[PDB]
């Protein structure tokens, strides 16, 4: 299957600091429809996983413009402006582009 | 509105049942998943049923073991599970992805349910 892989594991951050996590993917995951199925989800602790970014760029109701997507083909990358309590948790990316469906480990962030 | 519920320590061959209670929405358009997390924190999709039920997709490594059903007895999502190995343990969520618009896959989850093959 595509391998979903996250850097780094665990990041610590100080209230309003600036951030990147990076997920890299076994696979190409421009789907044959020109679209790229890469997706991001936040779970805060004790939570459930919730969606934060689809298809790479876009937000999803409710989330903050602090959360920005990018990447293409292998390489993505989420970017947090200024991290709030409320950001920690770990963030997951996920491929939907190819079958079997696959995530990554997740990335903690965690207050330093 | 996602619980889910029926799971347990159970033995490695074992069989098991989970099912997911739905509420708040309209269901039958509602694209209907499980997922489960490891220990370790990862994420593995286990399968999708569409609204409807016309379609399922489950991962290689379920296939045949396990059973996924959007039945009806109110609204439920349903997941029977057999030979159970324990590399099946982890927390068990149901998710939903709305059919009209294009996000994400799973883009609600539940509270999750635990199951725990052991001993």
């Known amino acids: 299957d595509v391998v979903m892989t996250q850097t780094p594991l665990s990041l610590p951050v100080s209230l309003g600091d600036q951030a990147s996590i990076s997920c890299r993917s076994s696979?190409?995951?421009?789907?044959?429809?020109?679209?790229?199925?890469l997706h991001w989800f936040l779970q805060k602790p004790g939570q459930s996983p919730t969606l934060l970014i689809y298809?790479?760029?876009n937000r999803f109701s409710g989330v903050p413009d602090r959360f920005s997507g990018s990447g293409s083909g292998t390489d993505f990358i989420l970017k947090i402006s200024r991290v709030e309590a409320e950001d920690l948790g770990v963030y997951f990316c996920s491929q939907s582009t190819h079958v079997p469906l696959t995530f990554g480990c997740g990335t903690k962030l965690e207050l330093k | 509105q996602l619980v889910e519920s029926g799971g347990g320590l159970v033995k490695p061959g074992g069989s098991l049942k989970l099912s997911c209670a739905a509420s708040g929405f309209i269901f039958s358009d509602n694209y209907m998943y499980w997922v489960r997390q490891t220990p370790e924190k990862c994420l593995e999709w286990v399968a999708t049923?569409?609204?409807?039920?016309?379609?399922?997709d489950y991962s290689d490594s379920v296939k045949g073991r396990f059973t996924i059903s959007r039945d009806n007895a109110k609204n439920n999502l349903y997941l029977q599970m057999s030979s159970l190995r324990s590399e099946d343990t982890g927390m068990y969520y149901c998710?939903?992805?709305?059919?009209?618009?294009?996000?994400?896959?799973?883009?609600?989850w539940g509270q999750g349910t635990l199951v725990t093959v052991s001993a």
């Open positions: 696979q190409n995951l421009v789907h044959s429809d020109g679209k790229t199925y």
């Open positions: 998710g939903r992805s709305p059919i009209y618009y294009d996000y994400a896959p799973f883009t609600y």
């Open positions: 298809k790479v760029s």
């Open positions: 049923i569409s609204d409807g039920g016309t379609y399922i």
